[PDB]
Ligand binder design. Sequence first.
Ligand SMILES: Nc1nc2c(ncn2[C@@H]2O[C@H](COP(=O)(O)OP(=O)(O)OP(=O)(O)O)[C@@H](O)[C@H]2O)c(=O)[nH]1
Ligand SMILES: Nc1nc2c(ncn2[C@@H]2O[C@H](COP(=O)(O)OP(=O)(O)OP(=O)(O)O)[C@@H](O)[C@H]2O)c(=O)[nH]1
Ligand SMILES: Nc1nc2c(ncn2[C@@H]2O[C@H](COP(=O)(O)OP(=O)(O)OP(=O)(O)O)[C@@H](O)[C@H]2O)c(=O)[nH]1
Ligand SMILES: Nc1ncnc2c1ncn2[C@@H]1O[C@H](COP(=O)(O)OP(=O)(O)OP(=O)(O)O)[C@@H](O)[C@H]1O
Ligand SMILES: Nc1ncnc2c1ncn2[C@@H]1O[C@H](COP(=O)(O)OP(=O)(O)OP(=O)(O)O)[C@@H](O)[C@H]1O
Ligand SMILES: Nc1ncnc2c1ncn2[C@@H]1O[C@H](COP(=O)(O)OP(=O)(O)OP(=O)(O)O)[C@@H](O)[C@H]1O
Ligand SMILES: Nc1ccn([C@@H]2O[C@H](COP(=O)(O)OP(=O)(O)OP(=O)(O)O)[C@@H](O)[C@H]2O)c(=O)n1
Ligand SMILES: Nc1ccn([C@@H]2O[C@H](COP(=O)(O)OP(=O)(O)OP(=O)(O)O)[C@@H](O)[C@H]2O)c(=O)n1
Ligand SMILES: Nc1ccn([C@@H]2O[C@H](COP(=O)(O)OP(=O)(O)OP(=O)(O)O)[C@@H](O)[C@H]2O)c(=O)n1
Ligand SMILES: Nc1ccn([C@@H]2O[C@H](COP(=O)(O)OP(=O)(O)OP(=O)(O)O)[C@@H](O)[C@H]2O)c(=O)n1
Ligand SMILES: [Cl-]
Ligand SMILES: [Cl-]
Ligand SMILES: [Cl-]
Ligand SMILES: [Mg+2]
Ligand SMILES: [Mg+2]
Ligand SMILES: [Mg+2]
Ligand SMILES: [Mg+2]
Lengths: 247, 247, 62, 247
Amino acid sequence: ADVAGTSNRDFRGREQRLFNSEQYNYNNSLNGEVSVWVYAYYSDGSVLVINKNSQYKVGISETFKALKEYREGQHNDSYDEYEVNQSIYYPNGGDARKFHSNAKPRAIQIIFSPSVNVRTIKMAKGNAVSVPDEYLQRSHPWEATGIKYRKIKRDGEIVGYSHYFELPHEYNSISLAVSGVHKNPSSYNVGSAHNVMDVFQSCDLALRFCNRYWAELELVNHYISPNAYPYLDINNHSYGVALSNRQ
Amino acid sequence: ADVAGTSNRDFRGREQRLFNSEQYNYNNSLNGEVSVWVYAYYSDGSVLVINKNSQYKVGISETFKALKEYREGQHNDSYDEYEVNQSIYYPNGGDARKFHSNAKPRAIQIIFSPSVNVRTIKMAKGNAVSVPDEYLQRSHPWEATGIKYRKIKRDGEIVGYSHYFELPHEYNSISLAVSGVHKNPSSYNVGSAHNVMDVFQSCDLALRFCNRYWAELELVNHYISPNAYPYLDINNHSYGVALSNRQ
Amino acid sequence: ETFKALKEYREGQHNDSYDEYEVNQSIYYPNGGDARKFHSNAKPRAIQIIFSPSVNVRTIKM
Amino acid sequence: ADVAGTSNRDFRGREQRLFNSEQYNYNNSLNGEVSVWVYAYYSDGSVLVINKNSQYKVGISETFKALKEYREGQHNDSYDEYEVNQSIYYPNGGDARKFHSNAKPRAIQIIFSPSVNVRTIKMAKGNAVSVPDEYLQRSHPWEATGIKYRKIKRDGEIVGYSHYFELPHEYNSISLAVSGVHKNPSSYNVGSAHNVMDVFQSCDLALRFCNRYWAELELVNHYISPNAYPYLDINNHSYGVALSNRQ
Ligand SMILES: Nc1nc2c(ncn2[C@@H]2O[C@H](COP(=O)(O)OP(=O)(O)OP(=O)(O)O)[C@@H](O)[C@H]2O)c(=O)[nH]1
Ligand SMILES: Nc1nc2c(ncn2[C@@H]2O[C@H](COP(=O)(O)OP(=O)(O)OP(=O)(O)O)[C@@H](O)[C@H]2O)c(=O)[nH]1
Ligand SMILES: Nc1nc2c(ncn2[C@@H]2O[C@H](COP(=O)(O)OP(=O)(O)OP(=O)(O)O)[C@@H](O)[C@H]2O)c(=O)[nH]1
Ligand SMILES: Nc1ncnc2c1ncn2[C@@H]1O[C@H](COP(=O)(O)OP(=O)(O)OP(=O)(O)O)[C@@H](O)[C@H]1O
Ligand SMILES: Nc1ncnc2c1ncn2[C@@H]1O[C@H](COP(=O)(O)OP(=O)(O)OP(=O)(O)O)[C@@H](O)[C@H]1O
Ligand SMILES: Nc1ncnc2c1ncn2[C@@H]1O[C@H](COP(=O)(O)OP(=O)(O)OP(=O)(O)O)[C@@H](O)[C@H]1O
Ligand SMILES: Nc1ccn([C@@H]2O[C@H](COP(=O)(O)OP(=O)(O)OP(=O)(O)O)[C@@H](O)[C@H]2O)c(=O)n1
Ligand SMILES: Nc1ccn([C@@H]2O[C@H](COP(=O)(O)OP(=O)(O)OP(=O)(O)O)[C@@H](O)[C@H]2O)c(=O)n1
Ligand SMILES: Nc1ccn([C@@H]2O[C@H](COP(=O)(O)OP(=O)(O)OP(=O)(O)O)[C@@H](O)[C@H]2O)c(=O)n1
Ligand SMILES: Nc1ccn([C@@H]2O[C@H](COP(=O)(O)OP(=O)(O)OP(=O)(O)O)[C@@H](O)[C@H]2O)c(=O)n1
Ligand SMILES: [Cl-]
Ligand SMILES: [Cl-]
Ligand SMILES: [Cl-]
Ligand SMILES: [Mg+2]
Ligand SMILES: [Mg+2]
Ligand SMILES: [Mg+2]
Ligand SMILES: [Mg+2]
């Protein structure tokens, strides 16, 4: 047989490259996943991740209370935190024993998989009572924030999209919903009558994941990297695996 | 009057038979319910049931954590179980005091009502981090498992459909979503523009039920039988009520 | 060992000690107890008996 | 065939009678069990039973502390009861918050199976520090109390032997051991060199049972009667099953 890495007859080499290219392209086909991640960063260094994976379109919607830090099997000032919530929903509404709850997110990172169309991204960043823009009556239910998404790149390939905003001020008390549509460069409308019921089933079939990791290191090591997910850490380092035309 | 059960003038008899036939046929009409049940079986003999009832289409989607046994108002090793989850999401990821959590499901039974079209059934059986097939990039978001569904029959009538799979191995750690579409032998597409917004409202109107029963006996006696639900027990016994053309 | 002695006991942890008394009552006599579970996960799933090579296998009794 | 209960050809009848006679006689053979039961009666009506079943010989030995009432999974004044023990071992030895502990037995019933030789029964009824007769130096380690055992009879057959003594006084604080030898009307000594090692193995193989029942009714219904055990209740009623030459 020919010697490895010396000719066009390195079929193991050609198959390895097609294996990777097929994974990348399958993800971008209409048969592929579109994924979103919401990272809620807490002052104790811990991170709540919410992931949703689904065909055609995907989104996450969380209340103000849902995004607050929750330590499973540990104490969480549960009564005082009810009182904190009352004071966030209306100024001087509660009877809490603290000025600032360390359970409030300090920042949010939204990440989409590379199969999303960035022009379809929408976000409903509401106040603590889940109103998008001060009062319902003058509220547009979303903002198309695609222009703000940074490309997460590895070896010159886009492995994801990231929108990051800090919540460092006392008044940064939010409810949050985000949505993205899978790329579709064809003229076959996935929601037209022929396929609309598959999109309705996709709403049933979407898989969700939620967990609080103790640190960004732990998130990078045990969540991001093992699953070949894209990520952008605090030092602006990009994580992911480049697959198109690669061995 | 004619004597009972001796002539074609037994109107009480004819009405009883139409009453049953009408119930069976209403369920199969586009005005009827389509229902799914997910049974998570635990080693202590207890069973978590998740039911969803809705028009046109229906589904259930649960995380790995959501399917774990939860004893309401009792102790549940809540801190150790956070640690178990960490070790299931990534090997050697946690610091648990147990090798196998008895809260993990030992088996899953999926049951659909007889108004489903078995060819529309889809299942997204993912790993513990809610990825359908090892990595997102090469994941088809579902599998059409209709061929594997067994007919639950009573008096020769199909009262439901059942897909059962055990999870007896240490590596059987899953996230699970299932979806089915109501039968529609007509050419009126329930999701075409005329009726699509009724299908969107059906997503709002779907009713969910969830409860942990202490034993299969208790499930059969107090959940299945009182509500005329179909079921298949561990001894392969079929439960349900035959209604078409019956008194 | 008694039936109770072979049941799982987690030292320094919770063990449903009251419910497990009730489990025992229902194992000693059918419908004898008032437990909140069908099967106790504390019951052994298997037993392995091992003897050293100095035993005479013909003298083993169980 | 002959008609039932009318001739010597009722083989079902003859086999039923041999079945019972064989059970009775097997128990009395050297291949059979010899059994002892110790019933500790508490003022709250509850009863601790200790049973031992073994070949050739059998006995039970309990400390003063071991015979005290223990409510599994409930509160038991565990610290005060340590203090009670100190005051029972030596007068004014402890710092308890009670004059009389309701955990102390109010009475003891010793019952042997009908396969025992009543002349071999021995009891070591010691004080609270496990000394049989005031001081070790003048203590015979047992008393042969066989003459005091009453025959438990059912249908004129001996189904067991009972020795009952109440402990109604403040000073009735005991440690207790009892032993009985299986009947052996032959001249084959079960402990002679030919069979001595089988007797040593019988010490390893003896099965023990211990449980606290809530009432004598409960003991009679769920312990005594289901297992065909002999018993004598507070109203002097005999329980057991007559088996010799019976259908
Ligand atoms: N600036 C400001 N924003 C408020 C206040 N109360 C509510 N908001 C909301 O908070 C959002 C702005 O938050 P930030 O961007 O963190 O505030 P900022 O003043 O721009 O401060 P920097 O972004 O850190 O420069 C707005 O879109 C408002 O909807 C307030 O008192 N001051
Ligand atoms: N067999 C196997 N499956 C694994 C392993 N790890 C994860 N899996 C997943 O588990 C699923 C198979 O589970 P099972 O069907 O219970 O395993 P099995 O080897 O077929 O064993 P049996 O069904 O009991 O005969 C696969 O579809 C994989 O996605 C593993 O180590 N061995
Ligand atoms: N009588 C008596 N027995 C004691 C005393 N202290 C210890 N004992 C022991 O208790 C045993 C006797 O107990 P009981 O038979 O209940 O006492 P009793 O005086 O005969 O009273 P009754 O049997 O109810 O008539 C004796 O064998 C002693 O070993 C004591 O102060 N008085
Ligand atoms: N929408 C897309 N989806 C998948 N790949 C894309 C997309 N747009 C561009 N690319 C490809 O990704 C690679 C990087 O192009 P990109 O435009 O991201 O890089 P750039 O021009 O160096 O940086 P930027 O545009 O961020 O300033 C190229 O191979 C490009 O063809
Ligand atoms: N898709 C359906 N929905 C409702 N009833 C059906 C459906 N298909 C068949 N039936 C009816 O249900 C009854 C049973 O038919 P079915 O095919 O289930 O039985 P079978 O041929 O004996 O067994 P099987 O097909 O499982 O080997 C018949 O009256 C049949 O007409
Ligand atoms: N040691 C024994 N073991 C088994 N059965 C015995 C024993 N001694 C006597 N029996 C038998 O048990 C039955 C009852 O005899 P037992 O002597 O117990 O009755 P009794 O003379 O009426 O009353 P008691 O002797 O108590 O005053 C008889 O069939 C007798 O042969
Ligand atoms: N603003 C507050 C906060 C707390 N408390 C009291 O302090 C007790 C303990 O506080 P809690 O907020 O419940 O915290 P933990 O019990 O420490 O934590 P968790 O409840 O999450 O286990 C509460 O029961 C509550 O009665 C209160 O009166 N007023
Ligand atoms: N891997 C583990 C498991 C438990 N623990 C400790 O043991 C205590 C009790 O265990 P937990 O898992 O909380 O179980 P329970 O309190 O018995 O039950 P629940 O919390 O569900 O009421 C916890 O607070 C935790 O500090 C621990 O340190 N490390
Ligand atoms: N069949 C049962 C089981 C439990 N309980 C009550 O629930 C309480 C807690 O249950 P228990 O069985 O004692 O478990 P834990 O306290 O969690 O564990 P342990 O006792 O082993 O520390 C008990 O005090 C008991 O009163 C009950 O009434 N009936
Ligand atoms: N003579 C005594 C008896 C009790 N106590 C105190 O009272 C507390 C509770 O009494 P205890 O005897 O332990 O009874 P419970 O806790 O009610 O029951 P248990 O310990 O059996 O669960 C103990 O911790 C002990 O410090 C004491 O100081 N002196
Ligand atoms: Cl495609
Ligand atoms: Cl219709
Ligand atoms: Cl013999
Ligand atoms: Mg706890
Ligand atoms: Mg609290
Ligand atoms: Mg307890
Ligand atoms: Mg105590």
